[PDB]
Amino acid sequence: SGFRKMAFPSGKVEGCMVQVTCGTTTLNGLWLDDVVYCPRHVICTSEDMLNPNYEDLLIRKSNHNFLVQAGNVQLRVIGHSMQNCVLKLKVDTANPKTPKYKFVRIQPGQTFSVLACYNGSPSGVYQCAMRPNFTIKGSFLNGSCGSVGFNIDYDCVSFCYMHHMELPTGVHAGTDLEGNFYGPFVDRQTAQAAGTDTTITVNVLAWLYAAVINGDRWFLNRFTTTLNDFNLVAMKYNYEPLTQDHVDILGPLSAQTGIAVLDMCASLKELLQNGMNGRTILGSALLEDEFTPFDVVRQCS
Amino acid sequence: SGFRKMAFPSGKVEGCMVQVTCGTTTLNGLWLDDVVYCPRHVICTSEDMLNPNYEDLLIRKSNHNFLVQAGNVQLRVIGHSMQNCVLKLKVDTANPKTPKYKFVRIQPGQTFSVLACYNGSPSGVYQCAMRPNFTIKGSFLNGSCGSVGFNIDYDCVSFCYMHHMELPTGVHAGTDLEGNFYGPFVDRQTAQAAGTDTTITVNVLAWLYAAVINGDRWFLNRFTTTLNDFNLVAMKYNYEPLTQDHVDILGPLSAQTGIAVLDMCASLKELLQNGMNGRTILGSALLEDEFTPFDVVRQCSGVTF
Ligand SMILES: CN(C)c1ccc(N(Cc2cc(Cl)cs2)C(=O)Cc2cncc3cccc(O)c23)cc1
Ligand SMILES: CN(C)c1ccc(N(Cc2cc(Cl)cs2)C(=O)Cc2cncc3cccc(O)c23)cc1
Numbered sequence: 001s002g003f004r005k006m007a008f009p010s011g012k013v014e015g016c017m018v019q020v021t022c023g024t025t026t027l028n029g030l031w032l033d034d035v036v037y038c039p040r041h042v043i044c045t046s047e048d049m050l051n052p053n054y055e056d057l058l059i060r061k062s063n064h065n066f067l068v069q070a071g072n073v074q075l076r077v078i079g080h081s082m083q084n085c086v087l088k089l090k091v092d093t094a095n096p097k098t099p100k101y102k103f104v105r106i107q108p109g110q111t112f113s114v115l116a117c118y119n120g121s122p123s124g125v126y127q128c129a130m131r132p133n134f135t136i137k138g139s140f141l142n143g144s145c146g147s148v149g150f151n152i153d154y155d156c157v158s159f160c161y162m163h164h165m166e167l168p169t170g171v172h173a174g175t176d177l178e179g180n181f182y183g184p185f186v187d188r189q190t191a192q193a194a195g196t197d198t199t200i201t202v203n204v205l206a207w208l209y210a211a212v213i214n215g216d217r218w219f220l221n222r223f224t225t226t227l228n229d230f231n232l233v234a235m236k237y238n239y240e241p242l243t244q245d246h247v248d249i250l251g252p253l254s255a256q257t258g259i260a261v262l263d264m265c266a267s268l269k270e271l272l273q274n275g276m277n278g279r280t281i282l283g284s285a286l287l288e289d290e291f292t293p294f295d296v297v298r299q300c301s
Numbered sequence: 302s303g304f305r306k307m308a309f310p311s312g313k314v315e316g317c318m319v320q321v322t323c324g325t326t327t328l329n330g331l332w333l334d335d336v337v338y339c340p341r342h343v344i345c346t347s348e349d350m351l352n353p354n355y356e357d358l359l360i361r362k363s364n365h366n367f368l369v370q371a372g373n374v375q376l377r378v379i380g381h382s383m384q385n386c387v388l389k390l391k392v393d394t395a396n397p398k399t400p401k402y403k404f405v406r407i408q409p410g411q412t413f414s415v416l417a418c419y420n421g422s423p424s425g426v427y428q429c430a431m432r433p434n435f436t437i438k439g440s441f442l443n444g445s446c447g448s449v450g451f452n453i454d455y456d457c458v459s460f461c462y463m464h465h466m467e468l469p470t471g472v473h474a475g476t477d478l479e480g481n482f483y484g485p486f487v488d489r490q491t492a493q494a495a496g497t498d499t500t501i502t503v504n505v506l507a508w509l510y511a512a513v514i515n516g517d518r519w520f521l522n523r524f525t526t527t528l529n530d531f532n533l534v535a536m537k538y539n540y541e542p543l544t545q546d547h548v549d550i551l552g553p554l555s556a557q558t559g560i561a562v563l564d565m566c567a568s569l570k571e572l573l574q575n576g577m578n579g580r581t582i583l584g585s586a587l588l589e590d591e592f593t594p595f596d597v598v599r600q601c602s603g604v605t606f
Contacts (some may be wrong), residue, residue, distance in 0.1 A: 001471045004440035006425035009416060011312030018588035115310065121605035122310035137584075139303035139605040170515065214471065276586075278576075281390060283438060285586035299425070299440060 001214050003207075003282045005290070006299060007113040008152040010125040013096030018075070019120030020089070020146065021067035028146030029068065030162070030177075031095045036054035036068055036075070037177060038146045040087040041163045041187050049189035057083045058082055067119060070095075084179025085187045087164060100156040106116045106134045109200045109240075111292050112160050116140060128161075129290040131194040131201070132240055134183025136161070148177075167194050202246040202291040205264050207288045209253035210227040210296040211281045215291040218279060221258070223266040230265040237272045249293050304511050304583050305589045306591070307600055308414035310377070311426045316398030319376065320421030321447065322368040328480050328605050329447030331460070331478070337376070339447045340465045341388040342488050350490040364390075365381055370421060376586025385558060386481025386488050387463060400458050404478040407461040409433045410501040410541070413450040415462070417441060418575060423441045429462075430504070430591040432543055434496040434583065436472040437462070451480070453606045470495045497501055500540045501590040503547040506565050508589045510554035511597040512582045519580060521560065524567040531566045538573045552589040 019137035020029035022042045034186060043051065043057045061080060066089055068075040078090040106112065118137060128136045140147070149161030164187055166174040171194055172278060173185040184192050185192055201215045208219065224234075231241045242265070267288075271273045278286055291299075317380060321330035330339035332600045336457055337458050343351065344358045352586055361383065369376040382389035407413060417425045419438065429437045436570070441448070441464060450462030465475040472495055474486045486493055504548060513521065532542050548562045555562050569588075577586060 001442075001467060002425040002438060002440040004429075004438075005306055006417070006427045006440060007308060009311045009315050009423040009426050011310075011315035011423070014310050014312040116307070116603075118603045118605050122312075123603050123605045124307035124600070125310055126305035126307045128305075137303060139305040139307065139600060141601075143603065166302060172303065179534065280587070286581070286584075301442070 001258050003210050003214055003299060005127045007127045009299070010113065010115045010122065012099040012152060012157050012193045013115050013148065013150055014122050015099070016095060017115070017117050017120055017122060018087060019069040021069070022061070022065055026119060027143065028109055028120055029071065029089070030146070030148050030159070031075075031091075032098050032101060034078075034079075034091050034094045036089040036091055037086050037162065038089070039162065039165065039175075039187065040082055040179070041145070046189075048137055048266060049081060050165055051167070051188060051190070053081060056244075056293060058087070059300065070121075082179075085175050085181060086177065086179035102156060102158050104158045104160050105176040105178075106130050106160045108134065109292065110160070111295055112147045112292060114163075116144055117147045118143045127290065129200060130161075130182060131171070132200065134197045135167060135169075135184070135194045136199070138163070138172040140166060140172055148176075167192060169194055171197075171245065196238070199237070199287070200241045201234055201240045201268075202249065202293065203289045203291055204239075204287050205242075205250055205261070205268060206253065206296045207282065207291045208255055208264055209250070209259070210291065210300060211251075212257050212259060213296075213300050214282060216281055219267050219271055219281065221267050221270050223270070224260065224262045224271060227262065227264045230262070230269060233269050235273070239272075252295065253293060259262040302515055304515055304600065307596075308428045309451065310606055311414065311416050311423065313400040313453070313458050314449065314451055315414050315423045316400070317396060317414070318418050318421050318423055320370040322370070323366060324363070327420060328444060329421055330390070331447070331449055331463070332371065332376070332392070333394045333399050335379075335392050337378075337390040337392055338387050338463065339390070340463065340476075340488070341386055341480070342366075342446070342465065343384050347490070353489060355383060359388075368551065372421070372552045383480075386465065386476050386482060387478065387480035401403045401456055402458040402460060404479045405452075405459040405461050406432055406446055406481070408480075409435060409447070410504060410593070411461075412504075412591055412596055413452050413461050415439055415450045416448060416465075418448045419443055419444045430501060431462075432472070433499040433501065435486075436470075436474055436498070437493045439464070439473040441467060441473055444458060452575075456606065462542065468493060468495050471485045483597070489492060500538075500588070502535055502541045502592065503550065504545045504590045504592055505540075505588050506543075506547075506551055506562065506569060507554065507594040507597045508561070508566055508583065508592045509569065510551070510594075511592065513558050513560065513603065514597075514601050515583060517582055520572060520582065522568050522571060523565050524571075526567045527563070528568055531563070533571055534570050534573065541571070554594060554597060
C-alpha cells in the first residue's frame with residue numbers, strides 16, 4: 001500500500017550527463033553514443049538571445065569553440081549540427097554508459113521523471129507532467145538548461161523532454177529530443193507567457209481510483225453522471241474535458257475497483273462542489289493531477 | 302523557480318541491488334563489497350513469521366540454502382551471520398559497483414530517498430521522512446522488503462533505512478543497515494500499530510521559507526513569538542516542540558529571506574489556529590513537513606552530487 005509521487009531510478013540517465021561550455025555559457029548535455037545533445041542557445045550570448053540567428057551563429061563556430069567535459073575527461077568534438085532547437089555535438093568517443101534508448105514526444109497529461117543537473121552533475125530527481133498549456137511545473141535554476149525528462153519502461157529509456165527556458169510565471173518550457181518545442185514557445189528572450197493552466201481531469205480520476213485501491217472511500221457517492229454533464233461542470237472549475245478515450249483508458253481501474261468511470265466522475269463533481277472538509281485523499285488536501293492511469297496501475301500492482 | 306519533492310540521484314544505489322531467495326521467499330538485498338545485506342525475515346516462511354527464533358532458524362540454514370541473483374549472474378555465498386534484524390551473506394565476489402558509503406542512523410524529522418525494488422530490480426525512487434512515530438509514509442507492495450533509503454553527502458552514500466514491514470495503518474516500518482528497528486516494532490507477525498504521529502515543525506518552517514523564496518508570501522505577518530508560546534500552542538496541535546537547535550539550523554534561511562525564525566513561527570502559529578483560509582502554499586493545501594532545512598537549501602541553491 002501507500003501512494004507516492006515516484007520517479008524512475010535515475011541511474012541510466014546519470015551515466016549520460018555531461019557539461020557543455022561555449023564561450024562563457026555553461027549548461028548540461030546528454031551524451032549518447034558519439035553525440036552530445038544540448039539546447040542550441042548554448043551558442044548564444046545573453047545579448048544574442050533576443051533575436052538569434054542560430055544558423056548564422058553556428059557556422060561561425062569551430063569545434064574548438066565547444067568545451068565538453070565528462071568529469072575529469074574533456075571530450076573532443078568532431079563536428080556540430082543543428083536539429084530544430086537542439087544542437088548535436090559529434091564527439092571522438094562513444095559513451096560506454098549509453099543505455100538502450102528511444103526519443104519520444106509526449107502528449108499533455110503525460111508524466112515523466114526529471115533529472116535536474118548543474119554543470120553536468122545531478123542535483124536531484126523529481127516527477128513532472130506535461131501541462132495542458134504545454135509548460136511543465138519543474139524546479140529549475142539557471143544552469144539547469146539541458147537537463148532531461150524521461151520514462152524508463154522496460155530497460156529502455158525514453159527521452160521526452162529537454163529543458164530550455166523558465167517563463168515569467170515560474171513554470172518551464174522545453175523541447176523533445178528532436179529539438180521541437182512543446183507548446184508555441186521559441187528559444188528567444190522575447191516576451192512569452194504560458195496560457196491559463198487547467199487540471200488534467202483523467203489523471204485526477206486515476207488518482208481517485210488509486211485512493212479507493214488503497215482503501216479510501218469517504219469521497220464516494222451514490223450518483224452517476226453523463227459525460228456531457230460532467231464536462232459542463234468540470235469546465236467550470238478550469239478542468240480539462242474528459243473524452244470517451246479517457247473513459248476507455250480508465251476502464252481497467254473501474255473493473256479492478258468495481259466503480260464505474262461515470263460513477264467516479266460524479267464523486268469528482270461533488271468534490272469540486274464541496275472541497276475536502278478538512279479531509280485528505282492519499283495524504284493530499286487537494287486533488288492530484290500528475291499521476292496517469294498507467295502510473296496508478298504500475299504503482300498499485 | 303519551482304519547488305518539488307526531490308529524491309537523490311539513485312544511480313550509485315541501483316548498482317548494489319540484488320535478489321535474495323531462501324526457500325519460497327524472494328526479496329531484495331544490498332550488495333556492498335563482499336557482503337549482501339537483507340532482512341533476516343528472508344529465512345522465515347509467512348507461517349514462521351508468527352513466532353520465530355531467528356538464531357535457531359539460522360543454524361538450520363546452509364550457504365547453499367540462500368540464492369543470490371545479480372541480474373543474470375548468480376552470486377556464490379561463502380558465509381552467513383546475523384546482525385540484529387538484518388542477515389549478512391558473505392559472497393565470493395566483491396561488488397565492482399560498490400560506491401563510497403557509510404551506514405548512518407537518522408533521527409525523526411530527517412528525510413531520505415527510498416529506492417523501491419522488486420526481485421532485486423529498482424522500480425522507482427521517492428523522498429520520505431522518518432516520522433516522529435518512527436514510521437515512514439512510503440509506497441511498498443509485497444516483495445519490496447530489502448529496499449533501502451539513503452542520502453548522498455558529497456560523493457558518500459549514507460544508507461539509513463532498510464524496509465521490513467507494512468503496519469495495518471498502511472504506513473511502513475524498517476531498520477537501519479545494522480538491523481536496529483526504527484521505532485517500537487519487532488520482526489514478527491503480531492499486533493503492532495503506529496503510535497500517534499506529529500508534525501515535524503522545523504520542516505514546516507523550512508518549507509514556509511521555501512515558499513517565500515518562490516514568492517509565495519501571503520501568510521507573512523507583522524508579529525513575533527517566544528519559543529514558549531509557540532511550543533505551548535504547537536503541543537496543542539500535535540506539532541513537535543521547536544528547540545533552540547532547530548532555530549539555529551533555520552538560521553541561513555532566516556538570513557536569506559530576512560524573516561526571523563520567531564517571526565515565521567508567528568505566521569505558523571496563526572496557520573495552526575486559523576487554517577489555510579482557502580489558500581495554498583507552494584501549490585499545497587496542507588502544511589508540508591517532509592522537507593528539512595538542508596533540503597530547502599540544496600534545492601534552492603542547486604547543490605549537485
Ligand atoms: C546565456 N544563455 C544561453 C541563456 C539561456 C537561457 C536563458 N533563459 C531565458 C531563455 C531561454 C529561452 Cl529557450 C528563451 S529565453 C532561461 O530562462 C534559462 C533558465 C531555465 N530554467 C530556469 C531558470 C531560472 C532563472 C533564470 C534562467 O535563465 C533560467 C538565459 C540565458
Ligand atoms: C514471506 N515473508 C518472509 C514475509 C515477511 C514479512 C511480511 N510482512 C509482515 C511483517 C513484517 C515484519 Cl518485520 C513483521 S510482520 C510484511 O509487512 C512485508 C511487506 C512489506 N512491505 C509491504 C507489504 C505490502 C503488502 C504485504 C506485505 O506483507 C508487505 C510478510 C511476509
